């Protein structure tokens, strides 16, 4: 996260760290959506251009964390994966269209002050909140500059008008993406960066005071953090895939 601030304790208790077993490293962010399901970006797991194609056993998720590097004894929980599910139409060839994946945990994680699931939006929450100007919030342990944070970082960014998103880039933007960030005139800045991807773009509903996950940190072009924007997977648009997977393969 570029130009963020340190997260408060328990501020983002659905935040998950995607952790490589060997060597020990942060791969990506992710989010807890129930006691055994973790949501992330497909490209965190499968990206052939970079010879990335992780199996379950290459990976751990670390839940309830604040510190990036420390083992947070008594606080964090580390879970192994039962199964990875990649959207069957995730487009790694072109533009990361449908950059979404689910991970089923071997065992349910215990909720605590530091570990708690985020809501997935309904049609109506999405329709009302996914508007240009409306700000969401992005969290992660990624780089601070296009170096690395001691603790989880947070930044609030406004959703951007679709034509402005499109005119900022040569990449073809689909309906399964939105972009967010400040414009050069706007005097405030911030963006996700390296290590943040797969993490959550959340918004707090003014109706029922609950945090909802609207986006997944998907891609950007640097971190320009002038005239560039971070792109997020549009979570509601893919929610039927999410539910299908969970209904079929969850117990």
């Amino acid at each position: 996260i570029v130009e963020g601030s340190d997260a408060e304790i328990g501020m983002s208790p659905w935040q998950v760290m995607l952790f490589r077993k060997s060597p020990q490293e942060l791969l990506c962010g992710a989010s807890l959506i129930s006691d055994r399901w973790v949501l992330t970006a497909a490209h965190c797991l499968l990206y052939p251009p970079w010879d990335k194609n992780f199996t379950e056993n290459d990976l751990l998720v670390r839940i309830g964390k604040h510190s990036r590097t420390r083992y947070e004894r008594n606080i964090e929980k580390i879970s192994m994966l039962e199964k990875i599910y990649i959207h069957p139409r995730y487009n790694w060839r072109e533009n990361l269209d449908r950059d979404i994946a689910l991970m089923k945990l071997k065992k349910p994680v215990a909720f605590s002050d530091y570990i708690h699931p985020v809501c997935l939006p309904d049609r109506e929450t999405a329709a009302s909140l996914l508007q240009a100007g409306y700000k969401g919030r992005v969290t992660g342990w990624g780089n601070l500059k296009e170096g690395q944070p001691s603790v989880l970082q947070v930044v609030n960014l406004p959703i951007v008008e679709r034509p402005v998103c499109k005119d900022s880039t040569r990449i073809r933007i689909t309906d399964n993406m939105f972009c967010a960030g400040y414009k050069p005139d706007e005097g405030k800045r911030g963006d996700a960066c390296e290590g943040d991807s797969g993490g959550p773009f959340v918004m707090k509903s003014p109706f029922n005071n609950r945090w909802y996950q609207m986006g997944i940190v998907s891609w950007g072009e640097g971190c320009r953090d002038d005239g560039k924007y971070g792109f997020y997977t549009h979570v509601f648009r893919l929610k039927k895939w999410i539910q299908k997977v969970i209904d079929q393969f969850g117990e």
Binding site: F19, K21, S22, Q24, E25, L26, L60, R62, R68, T69, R70, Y71, I78, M80
Partner: peptide
């Protein structure tokens, strides 16, 4: 860079 996590997890 990271702190050694418990080996049970590995």
């Amino acid at each position: 860079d990271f702190e050694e996590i418990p080996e049970e997890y590995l």
